[PDB]
Amino acid sequence: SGFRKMAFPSGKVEGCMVQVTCGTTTLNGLWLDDVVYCPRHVICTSEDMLNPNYEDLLIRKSNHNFLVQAGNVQLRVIGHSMQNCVLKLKVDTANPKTPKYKFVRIQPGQTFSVLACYNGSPSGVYQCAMRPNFTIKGSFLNGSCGSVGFNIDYDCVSFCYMHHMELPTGVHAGTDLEGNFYGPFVDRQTAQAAGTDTTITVNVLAWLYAAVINGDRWFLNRFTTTLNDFNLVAMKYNYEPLTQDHVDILGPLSAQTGIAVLDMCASLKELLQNGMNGRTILGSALLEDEFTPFDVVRQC
Amino acid sequence: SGFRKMAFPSGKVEGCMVQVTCGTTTLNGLWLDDVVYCPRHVICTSEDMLNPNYEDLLIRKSNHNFLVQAGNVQLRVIGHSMQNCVLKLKVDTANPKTPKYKFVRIQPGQTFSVLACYNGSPSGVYQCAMRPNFTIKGSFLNGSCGSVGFNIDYDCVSFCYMHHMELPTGVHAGTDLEGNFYGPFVDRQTAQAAGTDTTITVNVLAWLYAAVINGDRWFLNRFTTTLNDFNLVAMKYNYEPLTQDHVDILGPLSAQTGIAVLDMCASLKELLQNGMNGRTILGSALLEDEFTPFDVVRQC
DSSP: OOOOOOOOOOHHHHEEOOOOOEETEEEEEEEEETTTEEEGGGOOOOTTGGOHHHHHHHOOOOOOOOOOOTTEEEEEEEEEEEEEEEEEEEEEOOTTTTOOOOOOOOOOOOOEEEEHHHHEEEEEEEEEOOOSOOBBBBOOOOOOOTTTEEEETTEEEEEEEEEEEEEETTEEEOTTTSSOOOOOOSSSOOOOOOOOBEEEEEHHHHHHHHHHTOOOTOOOOSSOOOOHHHHHHHHTTTTTOOOOHHHHHHHHHHHHOOOHHHHHHHHHHHHHHOOTOOBTTTSSSSSSOOOOHHHHHHOO | OOOOOOOOOOOHHHTTEEEEEEEEEEEEEEEEEEEEEEGGGGGGGTTTSSSSSHHHHHHHHOOOOOOEEETTTOHHHHEEETTEEEEEEEEOOOOOOOOOOOOOOEEEOOOOEEEEEETTTEEEEEEEEEOOOOOOOOOOOTTTTTTTEEETTTTTTEEEEEEEEETSSSSOOOOOOTTTTTOOOOSSSSSOOOOOOOOOOOHHHHHHHHHHHHOOOOOSSSSOOOHHHHHHHHHHBOOOOOHHHHHTHHHHHHHHHHHHOHHHHHHHHHHHHOOOOTOOBBSSSSOOOOOEEEEEEEOO
């Protein structure tokens, strides 16, 4: 079969991307029904971003200060509000290309597709993970702010992420579509720090199962181990602690491959303690943590 | 900014994917204007695939033997022909969602986006490279045959690849949209072999430039070298030989980073001769050859 990092098809979301301008500042928005969602920092200059009072900046703006452009065609703004760190611009027109959608706050370790945009135009799509420290490792130039992350199930799009900023360290922070940040981040240009980025253990195990399925299994060993003792090793290598929840989520992959979860944990232990020794697994010389168990099943 | 493997937005191509059935056999097709393009092996059983005479199999089939389904809606087949290894089914209806398009035969080392499908339904999109031996390393289950590869420029889609088969070794072969195979492959279930898979040198250099731009440059050395002497080292590590064409293509990246192409070739030489020594470049522990110079510019 083979094994690739794979985004959801982006066409349903392409139809919702718009440009929003307010002063010089232009960025991407999401047009769903008769509402445009965008980062509230569209109302800031570069000067304001050091110490913005978002109340007082927004109080200067009326409905006509916002220029929403959908391809060639401008929308009329008949209502604005701020919910947390998102701006909700009410427009005259319902989007004809609105898919079935929900807004979801995802958990760290979950994956999603990102459509990266510039002036309301999609340019690229990729699959990523929400890191344990609530950052993402993305591609976001200037003009990409308000680029969005999603999952697709049936023909329901679940919107989980809006891009707001690059932190001084070059990693990325953003909100849900209710405008709450993931992590402790704020929409201001100060020195903000993420915690230690750990590896998502359950995703690693999932990927090892994907490897076995595809015929890569040099890493399978004789040993087994315990949950308890696995976690001591996990602590030392900055792996997330594995729980019984995690074990249960791997059960289908366990069933398909004939390998018990603790036997796979023992394989991993030895890769942590000895390294990969120059060899590769599914064409990679590192342990990949950016596929959930669900993603491996979907693909397999 | 950051740096990801990034597919083109797939929405323009989603609108062209259909199911084609002929006997039991079902696979994906591409509906452009009033023509459906699909792999000619849709007319084969599993038995036929050992030694198919495609003339004689097709001669048994009339127009009504082909069941083209577009979502819920069936098309009427008013003409069939075989061009090389593709079947061209003429239909009654022009596709309303036909984008501006061309068919292009790409060269080895060029990249494209793939939309992987099942029964005329897109499920996933990823970026890949045509390898020097004309194979691709893909994700293709049963039912994915006639999944398509493309590039997008402006709003022109350039269709360059149709998936036909998995070779015994688990790599993938397919055609252009004129039905000529890339490589020496045939659409039959025999033991077929690809040549030695070499690394695409110019793509590696492009990626090193991407690394420099993003602030990863531990690998930059004091040395320089010659084209001639670089290639001797390239030969030993199964890298493609670098030409003056290649040097010229890197000139914009050279201009932006302030590093001459031969100085970068010298960096690479030392990574080949010494390895990466456990360190990473743009989060990778191997040298990536799946971004062209154009891709790095597009993204940067």
